[PDB]
Design a protein around this ligand. Structure first.
Ligand SMILES: *[C@@H]1O[C@H](CO)[C@@H](O)[C@H](O)[C@H]1NC(C)=O
Ligand SMILES: *[C@@H]1O[C@H](CO)[C@@H](O)[C@H](O)[C@H]1NC(C)=O
Length: 88
């Protein structure tokens, strides 16, 4: 019974995933990533609103107590759908 499910990610030009929020809904189950996990602080809708295959500078951060805390560095990043095809 229940629960949990994987976090969404963006990748760099080569496909290395970095998650994009530190919390998730799983239907009504909430997950929180461990304090310290790499993440981009852009959010699930931040991810959805990104044009498939185009590059964004995504602000890097580290997770703490469920929020991606930015670290003022930035890194070049990507939303890739199945078969690279176009968003939404
Ligand atoms: C993305 O990251 C991984 C490890 O952090 C690395 O081996 C790879 O070359 C990276 N891709 C680019 C284009 O920077
Ligand atoms: C993670 O870090 C925060 C604040 O730095 C702390 O208050 C919190 O209890 C920590 N949680 C765990 C399980 O490490």
């Amino acid at each position: 019974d229940l629960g949990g499910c994987p976090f969404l990610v963006a990748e760099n030009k080569t496909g290395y995933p970095t998650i994009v929020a530190c919390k998730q809904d799983c239907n009504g189950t909430t997950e929180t990533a461990p304090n310290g996990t790499r993440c981009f602080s852009i959010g699930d809708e931040g991810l959805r609103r990104m044009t498939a295959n185009l590059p964004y500078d995504c602000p890097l951060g580290q997770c703490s107590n469920g929020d991606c805390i930015p670290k003022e560095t930035y890194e070049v990043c990507y939303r890739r759908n199945w078969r690279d095809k176009k968003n939404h």
